[PDB]
Amino acid sequence: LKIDVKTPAGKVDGAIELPAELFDVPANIALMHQVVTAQRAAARQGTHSTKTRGEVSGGGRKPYRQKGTGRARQGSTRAPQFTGGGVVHGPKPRDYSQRTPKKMIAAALRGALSDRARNGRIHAITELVEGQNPSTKSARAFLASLTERKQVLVVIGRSDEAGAKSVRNLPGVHILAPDQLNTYDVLRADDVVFSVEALNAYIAANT
């Protein structure tokens, strides 16, 4: 419920209070599962297609006479029982997206961050690098003084471009804006690091 803000190569410079109606929600597991599934399904590009018997090239005429041959009667040369025929009930281009309500998305997000705040996994920083030119070697060392795990979410503001560039090519660090918090990226990461300008923007947009 109380989080102390850390400085790079230094010590505490304040405290940010996490409100209880936004970071202490009971974790609804059967709700976080529908919101994760509705997000990964909206990332399917859906571009997969085959051809039916009326789009395979050729196959217009009836190939030979129906009676007297002793062969089976075959209708068209692009029937699906043939080699080279159209696919029957094959894939068409789809839009695998779902329509989850707003009150279920924003409640699975709060349940995901509450399970992070309850286990002592939410951190707060003032920035990632103290200067203005980026440096990964200093931002890697400061995310190791915080955590020691493999998957770290870093929530920083969109205007801090000098700190976003310092943690782009690290393995197991994902970067997003405060107005882009979602359930799948929070539950993937073992740890969630808010910038102190970014943590005051998630709280203020939810009263």
């Binding site: 974790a27 597991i29 059967a30 976080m32 599962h33 529908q34 994760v36 995901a112 399970d115 992070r116 286990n119 996994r121 799948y184 539950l187 993937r188 073992d190």
Partner: protein, 144 residues
């Protein structure tokens, strides 16, 4: 810590899919049809009763006409004016939309079902006959 390999749906939310026509141990060759007739290969329409005159042509039409110029009043009862406004005051067409008793942008109409004890001053369209009796008995007033 909840991770993604701890998320699982509720019991009974996600049942499987009986794929018809995949062997004799399940719904087998005829795929739940059995027949050799129209039902074996097609869809019989609902509007077809075999050739006799069907239910949608034996029966006569319903009598009359729809009115083209019918004005419709949304309804609030005075037994909900008592429950939603338990201290009285001015009651309007705009205060009933915010309190959830009536829809937006329609002509309200106060009817007279229930018990009214508060001293309400309600301003609606086209009051009932028993609404004016129950509001003025509580000391209120019913203005158009």
């Amino acid at each position: 810590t909840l991770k993604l390999h701890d998320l699982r749906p509720a019991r009974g939310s996600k049942i499987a899919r009986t794929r018809v026509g995949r062997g004799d141990g399940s719904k087998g060759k005829t795929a739940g049809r059995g027949t050799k007739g129209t039902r074996a290969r097609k869809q019989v329409p609902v509007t077809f009763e075999g050739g006799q005159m069907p239910i949608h042509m034996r029966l006569p039409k319903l009598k009359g006409f729809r009115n083209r110029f019918r004005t419709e009043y949304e309804i609030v009862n005075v037994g909900d004016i008592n429950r939603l406004f338990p201290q009285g005051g001015a009651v309007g067409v705009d205060d009933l939309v915010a309190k959830g008793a009536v829809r937006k942008n329609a002509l309200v109409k106060v009817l007279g079902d229930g018990k009214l004890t508060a001293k309400v001053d309600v301003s609606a369209h086209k009051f009932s006959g028993s609404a004016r009796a129950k509001i003025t008995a509580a000391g209120g007033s019913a203005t158009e």
